Amino acid sequence: FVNQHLXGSHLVEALYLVCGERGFFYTPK
Amino acid sequence: GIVEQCXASVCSLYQLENYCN
């Protein structure tokens, strides 16, 4: 799922799944 | 930033992980 265009909720879903218990930051420039 | 690299262009694990805490 990572190696594609990921926009909006799709991108935060990928961050959520990859980052796990670390969490993440979603900072659209 | 993440939108340019992952939405406007194809994402990568290297780049996604740069946004993990």
From Swiss-Prot, chain B:
Disulphide-bridged cysteine pairs: 6-11
Superkingdom per UniProt: Eukaryota
Entry protein name: Insulin A chain
Organism: Bos taurus (Bovine)
Shown stretch of the complete protein: 85 to 105 of 105
